Amino acid sequence: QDKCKKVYENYPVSKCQLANQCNYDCKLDKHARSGECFYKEKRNLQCICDYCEY
Numbered sequence: 749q750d751k752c753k754k755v756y757e758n759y760p761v762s763k764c765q766l767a768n769q770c771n772y773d774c775k776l777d778k779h780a781r782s783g784e785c786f787y788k789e790k791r792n793l794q795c796i797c798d799y800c801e802y
Contacts, residue, residue: 752800754778755786759795770795 756774763769764785774783774797782798 753784753796753798754780756795756797759785761793764793764795774798 756778759770759773763773767784770785771783774780774795778797780797780799781801784796784798786794786796788794
């Protein structure tokens with residue numbers, strides 16, 4: 749179970765609404781190729797990073 753994408757310890761759900769945020773941050777702290785947001789729990793939200801492409 750590698751998964752090019754990795755879940756962030758804890759990210760802001762509100763700011764997650766903006767893809768430019770999750771990516772910018774993910775590629776800033778994690779320095780990952782990219783970063784997107786996922787829909788966890790019933791309403792809660794999560795932010796996952798990306799370390800691959802194509």
